[PDB]
Design a protein around this ligand. Structure first.
Ligand SMILES: CC(=O)/N=c1\sc(S(N)(=O)=O)nn1C
Ligand SMILES: [Zn+2]
Length: 257
């Protein structure tokens, strides 16, 4: 099946998921001098005070922190969005070295990792229906650079030992995702897709300009996870990122000048 190895990596995905060569694939390089400042872009409204985190899971591709999305508890509005989007989960993509790891790039610069907060449009009823629509999802992307430690990320780091291998999960309650946001909410936005199979083109991307800083010790613990299941040959979970895809007929807009 698909993965990030040499025999099942991104360059092979198109064989089982032809949309891999679509017209609005993600991620992309954000060229800052080509981006169009759009004053018609509203500020983002992130309402995470009632968020209810439930569990943390190693799915063999990354680790996800899942939330209760049975009601409007953690929602994203405003920005380039029409309607209310509910937070369902968040996860990261990272590298084997501090010089790579992010999916999106800025003027070709790669960050150490990238955080993805996934939301789905409530007008569609369930996540499964949302992914089949062009405005189905809204993913908030945040870059991570290596520097000072991020206190609000340490609770996640500490629990990684318990979900080392594929399929493992652990209760993960009372985590506040507000601790993962940078000061400013200035962003870039463009229409795109999911960055791993099924690669559906149902995403409105909102990438924050301001990265968050994490310590080398924190990223190091991400790199100790495994792609493999327990009892199988150890394969380190690193470089689970898809390289930039052609922009084609798309315009990246900026909420700031
Ligand atoms: C359930 C869910 O969040 N799936 C996702 S999220 C996602 S991403 N990496 O945010 O574009 N890719 N896929 C397959
Ligand atoms: Zn992702």
């Amino acid at each position: 099946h698909w993965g990030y190895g040499k025999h099942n990596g991104p360059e092979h995905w198109h064989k089982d998921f032809p949309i891999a060569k679509g017209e609005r694939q993600s991620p992309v390089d954000i060229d800052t001098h080509t981006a169009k400042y759009d004053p018609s872009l509203k500020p983002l409204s992130v309402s995470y005070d009632q968020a209810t985190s439930l569990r943390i899971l190693n799915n063999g591709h990354a680790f996800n922190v899942e939330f209760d999305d049975s009601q409007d508890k953690a929602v994203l509005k405003g920005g380039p969005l029409d309607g209310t989007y509910r937070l369902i989960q968040f996860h990261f993509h990272w590298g084997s070295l501090d010089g790579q790891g992010s999916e999106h790039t800025v003027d070709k610069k790669k960050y150490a990792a990238e955080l993805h907060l996934v939301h789905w449009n409530t007008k569609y009823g369930d996540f499964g229906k949302a992914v089949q629509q062009p405005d189905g999802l809204a993913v908030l992307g945040i870059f991570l650079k290596v520097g000072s430690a991020k206190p609000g990320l340490q609770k996640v780091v500490d629990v990684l030992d318990s979900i080392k291998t594929k399929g493992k999960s652990a209760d993960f309650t009372n985590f506040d995702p507000r601790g993962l946001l940078p000061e400013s909410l200035d962003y870039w936005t463009y229409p795109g897709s999911l960055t791993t199979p099924p690669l559906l083109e149902c995403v409105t991307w909102i990438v924050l300009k301001e990265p968050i800083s994490v310590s080398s010790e924190q990223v190091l613990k991400f790199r100790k996870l495994n792609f493999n299941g327990e009892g199988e040959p150890e394969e380190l979970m690193v470089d689970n990122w898809r390289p930039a895809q052609p922009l084609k007929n798309r315009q990246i807009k900026a909420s700031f000048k």
